Structure 1
Amino acid sequence: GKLPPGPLPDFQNTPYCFDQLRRRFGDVFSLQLAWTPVVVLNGLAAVREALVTHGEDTADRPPVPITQILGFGPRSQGVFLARYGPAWREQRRFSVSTLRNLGLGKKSLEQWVTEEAACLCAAFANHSGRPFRPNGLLDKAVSNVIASLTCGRRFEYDDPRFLRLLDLAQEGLKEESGFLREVLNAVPVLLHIPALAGKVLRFQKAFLTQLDELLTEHRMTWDPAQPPRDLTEAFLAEMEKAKGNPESSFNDENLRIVVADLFSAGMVTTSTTLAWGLLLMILHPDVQRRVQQEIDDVIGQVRRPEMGDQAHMPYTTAVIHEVQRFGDIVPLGVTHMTSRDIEVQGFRIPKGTTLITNLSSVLKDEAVWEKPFRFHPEHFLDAQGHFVKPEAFLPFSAGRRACLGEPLARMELFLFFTSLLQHFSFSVPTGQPRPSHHGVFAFLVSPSPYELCAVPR
């Protein structure tokens, strides 16, 4: 019956504000947000006990009433915010299998991705030696991979339509984390204001409208006499089989949501990580070199990198993992909700509690890591040079709801990162201030804006 302690009754600096209460109230503390009961879980032990040991009872999401404006319904919840049940599980399993069939785990996708990587290197080379922000090109190359798997196509980097889409996307994930958002969610009555309605999800509504245009084009070009060559076709073919089934989540309202969930995560998570990687590589030249040495030793500058190389590349694998750990791009993951009463670290957490997993607190757990607040590839290495992955490596969270795109993310990071470091040497532009290793918090945590020089080898 013991409830977790907490203060009794910020939105842009949420991560660090929680770290404050952690040292004060402990690793499992309660907190009051509007009318909504929230419990924050900190450190591996508490997150693991919640998401794994009590996995069945914490795999639900908080109701989010605003998503009604985006056409959400019982059988239309996408994957991310989908309530725990049939609509969630059908889409979740569909995405996981469909990715696999499309070539995830095969040289098929491997060779495609490493081809977009070549497009990325040519875009970089076109800056000659001049300083530039690598973010936009990172977003394009990484969007194309997920666009290809879901939408059956890539875009040219100079494509106007593609640019409006990446912008709407970026500006939309911003709206995922808002003060007003939490307001209309704990107070669902506010949606009844048609004037106030529009402005809530300005960009997300507009992103879905742009995605609709692409999906419509895609219905026209689809050859249903052929095995589906991407996720949208596979979805469309299920949608056909389900004509007459009001229970199926394969409906038109859910196609735009599912593809929005997958496209946006497949883009903003991975490229932001890579922006982190490139920033850490110019702040730590010694590390950048030691990676390039391994690349040469194992691959040379002849052929494109392959996933078969990662096995024999423990240092590069280390660095990439440490980028994720240090970069820490999703400090608070995605909220969960208890669907049942549970006990965590000795405290009672009632059914219906909003659970926040503090992934930052696990990734930078001072008890687990040698130098939690430093960029230290040896966190994933031993004295012998072998790669080790500590249990506290949870940038993808844990449980029934853990990132379904992790295998895609891992192959993208390895191939893009190695390809870039295989062909370029990155540096802070002479005469410019040393860039902050601190990050700026949107919904995600991104590096603070920086430029670099990229000179070929």
Structure 2
Amino acid sequence: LPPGPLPLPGLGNLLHVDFQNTPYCFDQLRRRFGDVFSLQLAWTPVVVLNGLAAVREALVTHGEDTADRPPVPITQILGFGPRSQGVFLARYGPAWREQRRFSVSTLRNLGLGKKSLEQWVTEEAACLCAAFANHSGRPFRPNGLLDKAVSNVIASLTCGRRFEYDDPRFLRLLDLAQEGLKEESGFLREVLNAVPVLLHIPALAGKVLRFQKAFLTQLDELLTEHRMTWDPAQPPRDLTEAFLAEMEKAKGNPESSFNDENLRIVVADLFSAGMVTTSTTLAWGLLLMILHPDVQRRVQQEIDDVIGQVRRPEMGDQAHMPYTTAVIHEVQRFGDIVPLGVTHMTSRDIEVQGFRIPKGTTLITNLSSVLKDEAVWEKPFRFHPEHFLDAQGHFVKPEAFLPFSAGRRACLGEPLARMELFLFFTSLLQHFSFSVPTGQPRPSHHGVFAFLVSPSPYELCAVPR
């Protein structure tokens, strides 16, 4: 029994909400109805969850009943079916359990811990440092490079190799990724996911997700290319391989989720994901570093103390670096990359902050409202690294810190992300000092929304130390 806008007939609230700037409308509504309001976009019932309490209660307290995902019809066009749901949007069930366990364990096994992947990231972090350096003096937009660098890490783990920063196929992938991402929000997608005006209306059904489809077919190419060379006798060296060997081990039953339709989706899930997240965060990192050179200096120091200005950073350093760690965690809290997170759905009736949400209710965990809950952080809306430091000056991670959400569905890439961030971030400041272009206006801290929110375009100066 949560309050609500009470939408007009037919389209419901489909119109009362601005889908090109959702974060905004949801706050304007949490202002009228507050924390736990509800809207009915078309036939679909919804319940937006604001503030730490309402989020932790649904995702953790009643986690066993909110681990499902609401069905997303318009994904038929990408080849999603019961026989293949990948992970990201797979419904709570065994096909999802299987792929979730495969993902977490396989990545871990591919060296996601110490010595291996950790140095695969420093190898790649080098190639990035150089590309940066190769732009001596002249200011520029780092977004693109970071994106390539980070994507090369997820490529290593999934496709078995890295790509040259000049490779056209690589850059096409990156572009399609950023464009398919944008198609994850927007009025169009919403309306087709409500009114079946998409069945036999190619004009509509075609244009939507035109990039997501274009992105997936670029991968199928990479996969078939990749699968052609797969030699069973060699233990798997990348996710694709590990998956194919499972498709073999599970030749037995047609019930297994290890099959050709799933392979592209699971691989696409992880590839795309590790390709447009950390990267965006690293853009927020660098921006906030030129917008706050004072904090950049402090971190740049801690690096020289423990790590030194000559040897590459190692995960084992984070332990001895409380400031670099708090800055990074703050970059994430303030960066607030996935505002409304990822839609969940109730498996049975639940109660949150008093109201009672019925089964089949789409849940929208507004992680921004947690990442910046007024009743939690000292200075919520300002960049305050001391948010992760106690009196003695030792790093401390607060509960409200949920950039990866929580529950059975919590981001399964957190491990990779933590490592990527710390290694690329420090390796960058270790060998660099960034600042705003000498004669340019101070860059905006406002972010652009497209499901994921990145730092409004900006340039910076990269000079060596």
C-alpha deviation, 1:103, in angstroms: 0.6
C-alpha deviation, 1:246, in angstroms: 1.6
Q: Which moved more, 1:245-254 or 1:90-99?
A: 245-254
Please name the residue that 1:259 is paired with.
267
C-alpha deviation, 1:191, in angstroms: 2.4
Q: Contact conserved, 1:8 with 1:31, CA < 8 A, in 2?
A: no
Inter-partner Cα distance in structure 1 for 2:452 and 2:3: 28
Q: Contact conserved, 2:114 with 2:315, CA < 8 A, in 1?
A: no
Inter-partner Cα distance in structure 2 for 1:189 and 1:172: 21
Inter-partner Cα distance in structure 2 for 1:387 and 1:108: 26
Q: TM-score, normalised by structure 2?
A: 0.96
Q: Which moved more, 1:420-429 or 1:215-224?
A: 215-224
* Residue 4 (structure 1) aligned to one of 2, 5, 13: 2
C-alpha deviation, 1:173, in angstroms: 0.9
1:358-394 Cα deviation digits (max 9, x unpaired) = 1000011111000000000000112221101110000
C-alpha deviation, 1:196, in angstroms: 2.7
1:223-273 Cα deviation digits (max 9, x unpaired) = 210111011100000111222422111111111111111111101110000
Q: Which moved more, 1:412-421 or 1:97-106?
A: 97-106
1:177-233 Cα deviation digits (max 9, x unpaired) = 121111111223522223332212210111111001110111122221011101110
C-alpha deviation, 1:16, in angstroms: 2.1
Inter-partner Cα distance in structure 2 for 1:43 and 1:194: 41
Q: Contact conserved, 2:404 with 2:411, CA < 8 A, in 1?
A: yes
C-alpha deviation, 1:69, in angstroms: 1.1
1:115-154 Cα deviation digits (max 9, x unpaired) = 1000000000000111110011000000000000000010
SS of 1:107 mapped into structure 2: coil
Q: Contact conserved, 2:66 with 2:346, CA < 8 A, in 1?
A: yes
Q: Contact conserved, 1:65 with 1:188, CA < 8 A, in 2?
A: no
C-alpha deviation, 1:20, in angstroms: 1.9
Unpaired runs of at least 5, structure 1: none
Task: State the superposition RMSD in angstroms.
Answer: 1.1
Inter-partner Cα distance in structure 2 for 1:323 and 1:385: 18
Q: Contact conserved, 2:155 with 2:162, CA < 8 A, in 1?
A: yes
Q: Contact conserved, 1:184 with 1:191, CA < 8 A, in 2?
A: no
Q: Contact conserved, 1:66 with 1:191, CA < 8 A, in 2?
A: no
Q: Contact conserved, 1:55 with 1:399, CA < 8 A, in 2?
A: yes
C-alpha deviation, 1:33, in angstroms: 1.1
Q: Which moved more, 1:369-378 or 1:7-16?
A: 7-16
C-alpha deviation, 1:8, in angstroms: 6.8
Percent identity, aligned pairs only, is 100
Q: Which moved more, 1:398-407 or 1:217-226?
A: 217-226
Task: Identify, as 1 or 2, the structure richer in helix.
Answer: 1
* Residue 342 (structure 1) aligned to one of 334, 347, 350: 350
Please name the residue that 2:423 is paired with.
415
* Residue 53 (structure 1) aligned to one of 61, 64, 69: 61
1:34 and 2:35 correspond: no
1:376-420 Cα deviation digits (max 9, x unpaired) = 000011222110111000000000100000000000000000000
Unpaired runs of at least 5, structure 2: 10-17
1:79-110 Cα deviation digits (max 9, x unpaired) = 11111111111111110000111011121110
1:16-35 Cα deviation digits (max 9, x unpaired) = 21112223222111112122
SS of 1:12 mapped into structure 2: coil
Q: Which moved more, 1:28-37 or 1:133-142?
A: 28-37
Q: TM-score, normalised by structure 1?
A: 0.98
Q: Contact conserved, 2:184 with 2:450, CA < 8 A, in 1?
A: no
1:288-341 Cα deviation digits (max 9, x unpaired) = 000000000001111100000000000000000000000100000000111101
